[PDB]
């Protein structure tokens, strides 16, 4: 008979794991937004690589609500809406599916089916101007409860009752925007904390933000399976002194056979060899 060697492993690689994805600005900038005016950003049409999210300042929270925080890089999501806003310390626990209060009841309320990850961290150095940075406001005294992902940027004077107040303020009348005091004198729980709530919408339509490719290693001098770049195959991999002119991806011999793959994400001249 004719006994051969069967491919030991199935180590493969892909042309660059991921592309440039905008996981900054809503995650890393200066002035963010305000609770009353939650921002938004529909990231799509890009290979979502959530690895940059982890290599960031020790955060004060990473609670994922519905999705395993370890499988974000492997689930094809349809849309992801990043929402950034700066709240205080005692309000970090209020932003969560099913929790009420006064900063998540009328300012920003998440549904009871919110399949996302809330990310919070301390910002007592970038958004803590002395004497109190009064630029941030938080909405209060809403006529009714808020809805999942509902904006409230009105500034009409609201009163408790039986008090005419249209454009002027008073004792029982106040504007629906109150400043936040960000001073180092204030203890923990009153400092500014930035929160970005990635809302991963899970559906059945073609996903526009899939996770990065599973490019493995480059086991050499050992018979293995191959998917380098996109062609499938099987064989041993050596190191050749050939010089594919800067454009030639695959290689070929005098028999129309794949015989030299180019390191997808390492720009190198490997040479495929037969598994006897």
């Amino acid at each position, epitope marked *: 008979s004719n006994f051969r060697v069967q491919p030991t492993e199935s180590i493969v690689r892909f042309p660059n794991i991921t592309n440039l994805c905008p996981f900054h600005e809503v995650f890393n900038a200066t002035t963010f937004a305000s609770v009353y005016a939650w921002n938004r950003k529909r990231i799509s049409n890009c290979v979502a690589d*959530y*690895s940059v999210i*982890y*290599n960031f300042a020790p955060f004060f929270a*990473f*609670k*994922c*609500y*519905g*999705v*395993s*925080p*370890t*499988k974000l*890089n*492997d*689930l*094809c999501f349809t849309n992801v809406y990043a929402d950034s806003f700066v709240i205080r310390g005692n309000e970090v626990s209020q932003i969560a*599916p*099913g929790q009420t209060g006064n900063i998540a009841d009328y300012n920003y309320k998440l549904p*009871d*089916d919110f*399949t996302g*990850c809330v990310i919070a961290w301390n910002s007592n150095k970038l958004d803590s101007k002395p004497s109190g940075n009064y630029n941030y406001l938080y909405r209060l005294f809403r006529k009714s409860k808020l809805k999942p992902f509902e904006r409230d940027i009105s500034t009409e004077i609201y009163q408790a009752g039986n008090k005419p107040c249209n454009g002027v303020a008073g004792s029982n009348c106040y504007s629906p925007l109150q400043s936040y005091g960000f001073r180092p004198t204030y203890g923990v729980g009153h400092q500014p904390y930035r929160v970005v709530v990635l809302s991963f919408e899970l559906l059945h339509a073609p996903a526009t933000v899939c996770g990065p490719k599973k490019s493995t290693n480059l086991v050499k001098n050992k018979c293995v399976n191959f998917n380098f770049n996109g062609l499938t195959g099987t064989g041993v991999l050596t190191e050749s002194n050939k010089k594919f002119l800067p454009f030639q991806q695959f290689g070929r011999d005098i028999a129309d056979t794949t015989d030299a793959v180019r390191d997808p994400q390492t720009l190198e001249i490997l040479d495929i060899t037969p598994c006897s």
Partner: antibody
Amino acid sequence: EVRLVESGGGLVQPGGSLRLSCAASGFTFRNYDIHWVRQTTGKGLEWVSAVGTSGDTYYLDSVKGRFTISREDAKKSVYLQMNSLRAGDTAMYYCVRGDASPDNIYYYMDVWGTGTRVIVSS
Amino acid sequence: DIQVTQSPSPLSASVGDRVTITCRASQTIGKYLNWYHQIPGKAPKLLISAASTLHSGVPSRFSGRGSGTDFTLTISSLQPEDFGTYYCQQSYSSPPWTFGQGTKVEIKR
């Protein structure tokens, strides 16, 4: 078939530092996330302090700082080093392979291990 | 947070009975729950995952149920190996994967 050894041992004193290990035997160590559950004799399977292939390293808020997870695919095992331990970390430590369904998200911690043991008295 | 109030601690039982282990959550966790079984002197193992999808190797009428906050492990038939501590685990919690308190199904005389 698919076992998880937990040869770490423990006989530390208050303020010590022991180092555990969980070496798999039967699946892709890479394509799986190894956690670390703990059972006080007279309590309930505790936290996870999970580690991931994307280098994600999770901890509990009441154990953070005095804990450091480390995945090392070279010897197909993970490690769990701890700083000064109080008198509340004396328990049977375990290591599990938390996983969800294909693209579904139901973490079911299915492959449990042996049973490491920690004590902090005389 | 999201707590789980399993059945009262001691659940007497006979080799053949309808055992009801209740797991009620503080919110609507939909269909994110995992049932476990820890026999005294051995490592726990999975029984029901995702509320009703038994994993494998758990076949003794270990039926699950529930799709909101309250879930029930309906054991219709019991064997000597169907006795031990049972735990619930809301998958809707993620970073602090919280388990249950524990319910020991014992034997009756």
